[PDB]
Design a binder for this molecule. Structure first.
Ligand SMILES: [Cl-]
Ligand SMILES: [Cl-]
Ligand SMILES: [Co+3]
Ligand SMILES: [Co+3]
Lengths: 227, 202, 227, 202
């Protein structure tokens, strides 16, 4: 989707807010910590999302005005809500009512429950991770060193193909192997893995600029075609 | 709110806070989450992980030529052997800064960052200014961090559009003769492993 | 500039808010009326802006979060402020202080003044308009029917070349004549007029889509090259 | 406001209001504007202009074949002769809807609209949803206005990237036999002159 999230190459967002590492506080509000717990806790159990693909599309679907103002963990809250409702884990009406309760009475008590089995399960997920690497029977269409065409495609659903790289020539830098295909997986349409490549693009090609800059982007096979 | 213009009106951050609590409450009531599962995650990301892990890998590379060689040849095997592996760190690559090549890592589409090796990303890393600009004018972005590279130095920006993650291996600075591996590790900054800074002489 | 204003081809902005014409109120707040008076009154006298080029860049330069939330006449206020300060008509410090006065005391009295000569001058501007059509000594580079290449250019200042049309093939539909060149004029760098063309682009070319849709865009000569 | 995140926080609409008043006050104090100059503009755009002018042009085209021919051959000369000329209406073109061609006008980059002929644009015309979508999925946008064109009808979207303006000339509907030019003019909707609606039979 050609959304507000896809910012690469945009002008006008201003200076980067530099801060020294030691002063770069992770969390300033408890709800931000909670957002992390919600995301990892749900994902570890496959609730609403099993990999990050579905997670990302829920963020991408935010109203632009929300995306730009919610703050970062606001994205995480938005996508957990989106995905839990979308998959039928939570009912939208119930979620909205409960939201209203905490809006009007922020000090409403949170129910307590200990589940050490669930802790172990979550811990296992944090340490084991979840690799999207798969094997497929096909061979790679492209080879290291090949000049390829990064296609002009405009999926309305999820994609990992940034707009700034579309309709451009690039050079294959590496064949990673086959990875779960985001444009399908984010919409629960199957892993349908495809070869993933790293592709180098020159500044002259991306922007028409004259400096010694390049961008290395990872692109799925179906994003590209031979020249 | 004029119903022609609902899109002018953002949710306040109090909404997200309330929404978070509502999700937490409903999921615990339904048996999907527990208090201790949520806390376990918070402990991991706020306290257990951090850039010190990457710093140790950098210092080892500086002090042990054979290790640096193995790391650059097959980073994913080497990093997994060290235990720097996990969620968002399943496939970690390492790219070396050299005198004429400077590496910078970004996730233009979101925030992708190798938590198991580096901990949580910088505030600015996740925000639009860095994300938008670094792929197009990296020299201008780097200058805002105090890094003013000569035109003759090539910049390679690594946009994390897949689950493959990258760490930058920065060069050992002058003035470090005789330092131990542990002492060199204390020199390695988070920013240097993203590519937005060189390491200063001590 | 590749800014938030350049929305053509973006996904996620949602449904169009249909309203019956008779119910589609022009103004709901007096400051919105005032914004119109400020813009036209200043422009009529060449204060801050002489044509719409400088006007547009001031809007394009807004913080994205402001652009999306200010409401439409908010853009107009932003660009009048920008341009009057940029050209030295108003001092930023004085403007900010006076803003603060009206923030804390909204009912602060507005000074009254009648200037019938100025009224006539403004009226003349509303009726006479200001055509950007010029004559130049050069001939057009392109001809009706010619297949051209819409270049992949990425000016960081003002342009009228929407991103969705860049790096595409199109067909010349009309040669309008030479018009004041926005990419220069918006930055007060001279009219430097260039031939303006209307160019037809097919849906297949813009989006890879299969319906009988096309877009006719007006492009200055320097945005294009022969094939 | 956390100084890492000033960009999360929009100006409230009270800011724009105050800013407007501040500009007004300073410009009048400095002799650049007057109360009556500002009011003259407001009167013009809120009251003097409107879509009725375009409606008259459409009705005339429907009732006078020679006029319609001249209009389509040289709209800028013809419209100027009628007095429909002025700021943002210096160069106005007219495109005819036909049975197999449907025209839709947009300013993707802002809001450009022929004030002297049509008055101020619709609320939605200036907003991102219409602007973003109509160049890419015009059929979907039109359906939200109640216009569901067959696949076989070609759509031409006219993106106003220059100061050239376009008005759509919609087709005369059924059921209008014997109507006077003035009566037909009352049928012509603003939306029909943008291309987002056909005209209904009376
Ligand atoms: Cl370095
Ligand atoms: Cl029609
Ligand atoms: Co990311
Ligand atoms: Co416009």
């Amino acid at each position: 989707m050609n959304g507000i999230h896809d910012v690469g190459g945009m002008d006008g967002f201003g200076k980067v807010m530099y801060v020294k590492e030691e002063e770069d506080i992770y969390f300033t509000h408890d709800w931000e910590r909670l957002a992390f717990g919600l995301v990892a806790g749900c994902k570890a159990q496959g609730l609403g999302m099993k990999a990050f693909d579905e997670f990302r599309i829920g963020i991408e679907l935010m109203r632009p005005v929300d995306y730009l103002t919610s703050s970062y963990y606001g994205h995480w809250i938005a996508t957990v809500a989106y995905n839990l409702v979308d998959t039928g884990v939570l009912d939208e009406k119930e979620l909205d009512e409960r939201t209203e309760v905490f809006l009007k009475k922020p000090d409403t008590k949170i129910p307590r429950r200990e589940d050490p089995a669930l802790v172990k399960l979550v811990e296992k997920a944090l340490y084991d991770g979840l690799s999207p690497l798969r094997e497929i029977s096909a061979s790679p269409r492209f080879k290291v060193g090949e000049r390829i065409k990064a296609k002009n495609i405009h999926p309305t659903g999820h994609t990992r193909f940034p707009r700034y790289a579309r309709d451009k020539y690039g050079v294959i830098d590496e064949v990673y192997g086959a990875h779960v295909f985001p444009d399908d997986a984010a919409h629960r349409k199957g892993e349908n893995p495809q070869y993933l490549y790293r592709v180098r693009f020159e500044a002259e090609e991306l922007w028409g600029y004259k400096q010694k800059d390049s961008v290395y982007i990872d692109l799925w096979e179906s994003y590209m075609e031979p020249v | 709110i004029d119903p022609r213009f609902p899109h002018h009106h953002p949710r306040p951050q109090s909404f997200w806070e309330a929404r978070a609590k509502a999700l937490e409450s409903l999921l615990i009531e339904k048996g999907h989450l527990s208090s201790d599962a949520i806390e376990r995650v918070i402990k991991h990301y706020e306290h257990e992980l951090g850039p010190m892990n990457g710093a140790k890998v950098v210092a080892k590379a500086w002090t042990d030529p054979a290790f640096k060689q193995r790391l650059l040849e097959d980073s994913e095997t080497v990093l997994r052997e060290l235990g720097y592996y996990g969620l968002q760190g399943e496939h970690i690559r390492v790219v070396e800064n050299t005198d004429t090549v400077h590496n910078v890592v970004v996730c233009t589409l979101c925030s992708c960052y190798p938590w198991p090796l580096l901990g949580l990303p910088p505030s600015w890393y996740k925000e639009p200014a860095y994300r938008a600009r670094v792929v197009k004018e990296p020299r201008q972005v780097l200058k805002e961090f105090g890094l003013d590279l000569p035109d003759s130095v090539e910049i390679r920006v690594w946009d994390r559009s897949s689950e493959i993650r990258f760490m930058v291996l920065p060069q050992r600075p002058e003035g470090t003769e005789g330092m131990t591996e542990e002492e060199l590790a204390k020199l390695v900054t988070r920013d240097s492993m993203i590519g937005v800074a060189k390491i200063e002489p001590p």
